[PDB]
Amino acid sequence: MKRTFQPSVLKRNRSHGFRARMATKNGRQVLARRRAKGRARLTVSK
Template identity: 60%
Template sequence: MRRTLEGTKIKRQHVSGFRARMATPGGREVLNRRRAKGRHRLAIQAKKRA
């Protein structure tokens, strides 16, 4: 039996990635808020493959 919710990396990038945030006025607000707060990571980042 499968779990009911399984995320996908592609979907996550398309919704929450840096370029997705930059594409809309609301997303840019999110980034600016995170910059103002001093967040080390502004948006999620794909993990580097070894």
């Protein structure tokens, strides 16, 4: 049956993408946290 994850790269990079996080205060705040944790993978990319 149709499951909830139907992938789409455009929609991905748009809602959770790097620049989408850079767009807004609280999105940039996310990036900070992930950098504080020292995350290997800030966002998902090419």
